[PDB]
Structure formats: C-alpha cells, structure tokens
Amino acid sequence: NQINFTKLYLHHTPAGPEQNQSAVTSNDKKIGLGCIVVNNWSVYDGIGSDAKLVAYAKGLHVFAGAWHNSFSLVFEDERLKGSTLQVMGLIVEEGDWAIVGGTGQFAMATGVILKKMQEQKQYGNIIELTIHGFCPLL
Amino acid sequence: SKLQITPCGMLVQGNQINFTKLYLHHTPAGPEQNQSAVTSNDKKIGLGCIVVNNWSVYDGIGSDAKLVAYAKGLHVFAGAWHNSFSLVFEDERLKGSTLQVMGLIVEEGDWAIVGGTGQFAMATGVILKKMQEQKQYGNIIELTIHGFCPLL
Amino acid sequence: LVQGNQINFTKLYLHHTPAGPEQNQSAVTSNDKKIGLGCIVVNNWSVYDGIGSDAKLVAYAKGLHVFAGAWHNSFSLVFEDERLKGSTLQVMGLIVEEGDWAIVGGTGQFAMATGVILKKMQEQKQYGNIIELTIHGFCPLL
C-alpha cells in the first residue's frame, strides 16, 4: 500500500525579491567545498497562479562536490497540518531523495522522492516532486 | 570491495520499544548552557542561524533524576528549527546504543526516529515532545519514545 | 513480513584527510570556547575498494559532521562505479574513526535502505587516516 501523493512543486529561489534561502558559509578556495545554505523552500500542490501552498521544505544543504540536503517537509495543508516528512539526499534540482522518516499522519514513513526540473526563472526554479512513500500506520 | 545480496524477510513489528518519562534539558543560556549558535540569521531573508546542541536527557524531574543520554547534533532555523542529532545513551544497560533523530521544532511537536545503532539498530518510530517546565535559562522538554526495531 | 534483500558491503576503505595536499574536508565554523562545541566540517571523503596504489575510487561520502562533545555525522554515500552510479546511502551517527553508523535511507538501487555501518581504523597517516567500512543493511523489494 503506497501513499497516494499528488505531484508537488518545490520553489527553489536562491536570490531575487522572493528569495527563500541563504548561504551562511562559503567554499574554501583550497578544497572547493564548505558552503552551507539554509533553505525554507515553499511547496505547492500544483502549477499555475491558483496553486496553493501545502508544505515547506525547512532545512539545509551543504556543498561537498555535490549538494547534500537535509530538511523537514512540514505540511501546511489543513488536513495534514503538523505532519512532516523527513528527507535526506543529494542534489537539489535533479536526482533522488530519501524519505528517512516522518511524523503525525506519516509516522514511520519510508520511501524516495524523485526530482525533475520543470521551469527555470530569473531568480529561481521550480522542481517537480514525485513521492513514493510507505507508512505502516495500520 | 565485496557486496553480497541475500533475499530474506523483515519483521516490521519485531521489537517494540516505548520509553516514557524522559526529560530533555534545552538550555540556550546560563552557566549550564549546552548549545551554541555558530551562524546568525540573514537580516534580509530571516533565516540561517545554525546552533550546535549537546542537550542532556534525564530520566525524571527533580533532584533524584539521573542523566541517561545526550542529544548530540545540530538544529537550524529556516522559519522553524529543523533538528538532526544522535541520541547517544550513557546508562549502563544501553551504553553505546544511539537513536538518530530528525524533525521540526524543539519545544513541542514530534520528532522522527530515522535509525539507530547498537541495541537500536534499524530503529524506526517517533518522539513526542511536550513542555514540562519553563526555567530561567531554558526549559525541560518531556520526551515520549514510540518506535519499533526489526529483527530480520 | 516484508520481502527484500540484505545488502552486505565489506572491505570499503574511506579516506579521512583533514590536512595535506589531498585534504578532502574543511572546517567552516569554529568551536565556541565558552561551551566547547560548534565546529562544523564539510567533508567529501573518498571511498576506495582496497589499499595500495591499485585501489579504485568507488564512492564518495558527501555531507558534514558537527562537534557537540563528539562528532555527529550526516552525509550521503553516493557510489561512482558504473553499475551503482547515482545510488546513495543516507548515513547518520556519531564518531568518525570508530564506532557505529546508522543507515537511515537510500536511493536508486538501495531505495529505502535500513541498517548500520561499522567502522575500524586501518592505516594512520601523517595527514589523515583510512577507515574500513562494513555495511549491514536491508532493502525492501522494489
């Protein structure tokens, strides 16, 4: 039994008037790593001007040749308020992420999250999320 | 290197562990301060502060309580506090066994048990947070551990 | 019960190089002298299939470790070999040069991986050390 999730759309905005992340450390010129970025990525349930906010991706990603992410996917949805998905994995725009756990309605969750670039804007981009999660809450 | 793959089965509801009446001392200030911020929030964005924590965990409230574990890790502010730490136990019967914890919010809410080592290998579950006592230099947070350990 | 596969890695050798011309990590924050914690190091540890000059690089440990009395780790173990290219193992735990690590997830060929990673000191060098990794994990079928 797989959780029937809709495709989510993460707004990754590094700069601009709607910037939702910030770098707190920089990369060492000798090694080429070390940059840490704290992010509060907004996550919508769809595309378009009437898409509503349903979750936040609150955490950080560090650059060590590739970006290693660690964030809580906390749901602002009315029915799923409080429940979170715990995500850890490599790369922001493409690749996969691991569902290492969850809380509330998604307690003891496990699965993966597929990422796909959908739109590149001037100060950010939108990343499509496909969640293949499983919950033994039964 | 060598990678072996063996088909088998996983007993999800193998060993159920339930720890009640655990109290974490979250002390951001004072002489007993057990954490420190190493970055500050970006004044334009409103986030970025990273705090490294070594929270002590006791088996009760009062003077008869004894330290049983340390919450060693970090928590970063991105509108709320996202945690990530190893709950390493220090008592005799559980020395070495750790619980890997991730989740939002420190004072309340729920934390996710994403793994463990030693006696808590492959552990999954949740940790319930509840405000127990507010103090001058911080607060005591009651923890309620509900999880499972697969046996395989 | 859940049908799956028990994955067992042996003889993986991680290069932990804090200094030298092959340094593969860098501290970004310092320890707070008042409390005794706060040092954050971002690490890109190389993992090889053996010891010696004939060893091939098979994976990277990309993440970070913070000091709070001990070293709390969080990183992705992404493999570089052709068969496992892109697949990762999500790892969290305490101590770098010894002890146990926990497998909290995985992607690609190791989706929903759960288990532990054992560490053991092998070679102590002037600029770093080499840690042998033994992985005992489980992945559910598909």
Residue ranges with strand state E in C68-128: 71-79, 88-94, 100-107, 114-124
- Cross-chain residue pair B12–A136, CB shorter than 8 Å: yes
Q: Do B112 and A104 touch (CB under 8 A)?
A: no
Spatial distance between the Cα atoms of B86 and B74, rounded to a whole number of angstroms: 9
Q: Which domain holds residue B74?
A: 20-149
Does any CB of chain A come closer than 8 Å to the CB of residue B137? no
Give the B:C interface size as CB pairs under 8 Å: 149
Give the 3-state secondary structure of residue A104: helix
- Taking alpha carbons only, the member of C118, C133, C113 closest to residue C5 is C113
Residue B7 covered by a domain:
no
Experimental method: X-ray
Beta-carbon contacts of B18 under 8 Å, excluding residues fewer than 6 positions away, are B145, B146, B147
- Chain A residue with Cα closest to B80: A58
Contact residues, chain B, for C93 at CB < 8 Å: 86, 98, 100, 115, 117
B82: domain CATH number? 2.40.480.10
Candidates C79, C112, C141, C142: best to mutate against A (most CBs of A within 10 A) is C112
- The answer on whether A87 is annotated among ligand-binding residues is no
**C-alpha to C-alpha distance for A132 and A110, rounded to whole angstroms:** 8
Whether residue B61 is contained in a domain is answered as yes
Chains near C (3 or more Cβ pairs under 8 Å): A, B
CA–CA dist C86, C76 (Å, integer): 11
Chains near B, with 3+ CB pairs < 8 A?
A, C
DSSP state letter for C108? G
Question: What's the one-letter identity of residue A21?
Answer: Q
**Quick one: DSSP state of residue A16?**
S
Exposure letters C90-104 (e unless 16+ CB within 10 A, then b): bbbbbbbeebbbbbb
Distance of alpha carbon A68 from alpha carbon B12, whole angstroms: 29
**C109: helix, coil or strand?**
helix
CA distance C87 to C135: 15
| Nearest residue to A52 via CA among A109, A18, A94, A11 | A11
CA-angle at A130, arms to A124 and A131, nearest 5°: 125
Taking a contact as any Cβ pair under 8 Å apart, which residues of chain C between 36 and 55 contact chain B? 37-40, 49-50
Nearest to B54 by CA among B69, B36, B41, B72: B72
Entry resolution in angstroms?
A: 2.2
Residue of A3, A24, A28, A31 best to disrupt the C interface, most CBs of C under 10 A? A31
C79 touches chain A (CB under 8 A): no
In angstroms, rounded to a whole number, what is the distance separating the alpha carbons of residues B122 and B151? 9
Give Cα B31 to chain centroid, integer Å. 22
C78 closest CB neighbour out of A25, A88, A90: A90
How many folded domains does chain C comprise? 1
Contact B115 C100 (CB under 8 A): no
Residue A3 counted as domain residue: no
Identify which of B45, B79, B114 has the shortest CB distance to residue A86. B114
Residue B111: closest CA among chain A residues belongs to which residue? A103
Using an 8 Å Cβ cutoff, are B9 and B149 in contact?
Answer: no
C76 neighbourhood in chain A, CB within 8 Å: 66, 68, 88-90
Closest CA of chain C from B33, distance in Å: 7
* C56 contact partners, CB below 8 Å, separation of at least 6: C48, C49, C50
- Which contiguous run of DSSP H or E holds residue A82? none
**Tokens encoding B99:** 């619980």
Q: CB-based contact (8 Å) between B28 and chain C?
A: no
Which chain B residues touch A18 with a CB distance below 8 Å? none
Q: How many residues does chain B have?
A: 152
Please report whether residue B53 resides in a domain.
yes
In a domain, A129, yes or no: yes
